[PDB]
Specification:
Oligomer: heterodimer
Family (chain B): Belongs to the histone deacetylase family. HD type 1 subfamily.
Shape of chain B: globular
Organism (chain B): Homo sapiens (Human)
Number of helices of chain B: 11
Strand order of the largest sheet of chain B: 2-1-3-8-7-4-5-6
Radius of gyration of chain B: 19 Å
Pfam families (chain B): Hist_deacetyl
Keywords (chain B): Chromatin regulator, Chromosome, Cytoplasm, Disease variant, Hydrolase, Intellectual disability, Metal-binding, Nucleus, Obesity, Phosphoprotein, Repressor, Transcription, Transcription regulation
Largest interface: A-B, 4 and 13 residues
Strand content of chain B: 5-15%
Subcellular location (chain B): Nucleus; Chromosome; Cytoplasm
Bound molecules: potassium ion, zinc ion
Chain lengths: ~5, ~375
Amino acid sequence: RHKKX
Amino acid sequence: LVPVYIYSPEYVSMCDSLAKIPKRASMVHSLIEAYALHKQMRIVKPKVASMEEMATFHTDAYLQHLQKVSQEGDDDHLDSIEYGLGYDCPATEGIFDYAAAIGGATITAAQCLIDGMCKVAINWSGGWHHAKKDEASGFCYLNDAVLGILRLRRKFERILYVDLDLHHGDGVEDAFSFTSKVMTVSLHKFSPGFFPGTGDVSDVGLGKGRYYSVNVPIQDGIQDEKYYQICESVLKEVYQAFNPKAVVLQLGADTIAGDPMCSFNMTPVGIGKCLKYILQWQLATLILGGGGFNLANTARCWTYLTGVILGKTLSSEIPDHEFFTAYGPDYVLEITPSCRPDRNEPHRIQQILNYIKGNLKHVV
Ligand SMILES: [K+]
Ligand SMILES: [K+]
Ligand SMILES: [Zn+2]
């Protein structure tokens, strides 16, 4: 799960 | 033959309330209005999406959770992390009404195209392409793009989705990864650590939908000329192979120079050339917004692109209006590229374009 932000 | 412009004062006020882009919808409409472009379009009041309309893509469990946390603004709910609510997508009060409004606006736009009252329908406040069926993601709570495509599906047998946002439109791609009746094309920044982390050229969809997902991984610093070369090359091959009956185009302005994300180095003129290429197909076209975190530049871009759609040349000087003060330091419509390197190597781009050409040979 990446962060946008 | 007159473009439909999805707008109401109530709708804009709602879109203004998104924490990640406050007042952006107002600034975009205010500039468009200042250029008097709205007088050249058919203004259509958006409907609010019903629970059933939203359930055509999103699961009831997710939708019920959204409605729940929307009542009190329940941040720190035990199940929120599972449904993607967090830093990128906070559980704020009234967020369900926000979701239903934007989802309804894109559906309304799609319905206009179905009814044949227009050939171009515009919803600049839509284009939230990261949301999954059961998960909020990347500032997106509801995937209005998917809902719009599903509506267009009632009339158009093959739909082309083109995603020119800085980020990979993973929500829309995943939604249709198993079908050959919707082809998704995304040009985006691709680099380990960069959101959302997916969308390599090797990602081509699954099952019956294999080779009906096209991904174009691009590096920092790309400018108008090279970007259009890439875009025109892919879209030409896609159009010939897939033969779309309708187009959904996502034009997130976080590619534009001056964006705090500072990745691509584009101007609205470059994006406009891609838009013109799609427009000359004379197909039913749904225009969406998306990213864009320099609010004045995002307004600059989508106002310019609206002029492109209308076939009008706009004055270079920003006219006086409510947000005129935000258009410093030069108060002009045009945007100057930043003086930084283009990290895209021509051989890498060429390899990517060749990989895609090979994949599209299967599309018949
Ligand atoms: K994209
Ligand atoms: K697909
Ligand atoms: Zn984006």
